[PDB]
Homo-oligomer: A and B are copies of this chain.
Amino acid sequence: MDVVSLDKPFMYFEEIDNELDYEPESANEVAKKLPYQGQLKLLLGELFFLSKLQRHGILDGATVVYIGSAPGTHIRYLRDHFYNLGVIIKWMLIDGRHHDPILNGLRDVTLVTRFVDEEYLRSIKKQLHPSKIILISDVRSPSTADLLSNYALQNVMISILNPVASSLKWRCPFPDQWIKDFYIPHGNKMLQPFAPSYSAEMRLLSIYTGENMRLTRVTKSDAVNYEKKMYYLNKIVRNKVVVNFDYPNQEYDYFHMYFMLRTVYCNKTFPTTKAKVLFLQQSIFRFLNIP
């Protein structure tokens, strides 16, 4: 067994303290172990991001514009969590594909069947005005050309919608597939537990203060760095059993999930953080139909 003792898990990209040369043979290795693991991945990352906005007093009364939301099965849990907490939020879910019918029949959530473009963003902004907007993007076309195209759309989402905070899908193109240096919004690179086995994807979390917009250039050397750091995280780290983690499941991703869940607010009062986490996790797994 691959046992280890850790204080805390890597929460953000910069925390990764090591790197490994990427082995193309890892692509042939099992990417997932849990059913609906993709929804789980999304649900934790988005509960984490949103509970933070709550902490900063910017969630209540906002409209959450989720682009690339279908099927969005896990969004029903998020919606319920904050609704039962008393937070007022309107959800506007937009995708060209169809949403999980469990999202229908709620006055607070609007489902839109449209692939967004810069023009469409302009009209929703006019229609959402003067409400405060929180943006979540999970759009997917892939080629480095597809990526750049997605990243270029997400930057336009921010400039047109002018959100108070944003969660964006972020995976650096692979160095050996570089095309050109590009800019991405400045934010925290939140690492994702339950991401596919060798995924280099994270979520770019940002809060907008003032009327400024800070971007950051991404170069090929940066692309090499992402690859080695994420390859070390995936191959080595995520494969560890954290023995000093007293929890029903000691695998790294559960240790990592625990740290995200401990930040979530609840109505029920608990004697320990472990009590809360076990509860939220149980709750989350039952909702998602994960054994």
Contact = CB atoms under 8 A, between A and B. Distances in A.
A213 interface: yes
A115 interface: no
Interface string A183-201: 1001000000000000000
A143 to B, nearest CB: 20
Interface stretch (A47-55, A214-222, A264-272): A214-222
A181 B219 CA distance: 29
Interface residues of A, number: 13
Interface string A101-138: 00000000000000000000000000000000000000
Contacts of A212: 186, 214-217
Nearest to A218: B211
A162 interface: yes
Given A159-B183, A183-B159, A213 B216 contact: yes
A36 to B, nearest CB: 38
Contacts of A162: 181, 217
Nearest to A210: B216
Contact of A183 (B213, B216, B219): B213
A217 B213 CA distance: 8
A162 B219 CA distance: 12
Interface string A252-268: 00000000000000000
Nearest to A214: B214
A215 B216 CA distance: 11
A219 B162 CA distance: 12
Contacts of A217: 159, 162, 211-213
Contacts of A186: 212
A183 B211 CA distance: 10
Interface string A205-240: 000000111111101000000000000000000000
Given A186-B212, A213-B214, 18 more contacts: A159-B183, A159-B217, A162-B181, A162-B217, A183-B213, A211-B216, A211-B217, A211-B219, A212-B214, A212-B215, A212-B216, A212-B217, A213-B215, A213-B216, A213-B217, A214-B214, A214-B215, A215-B215
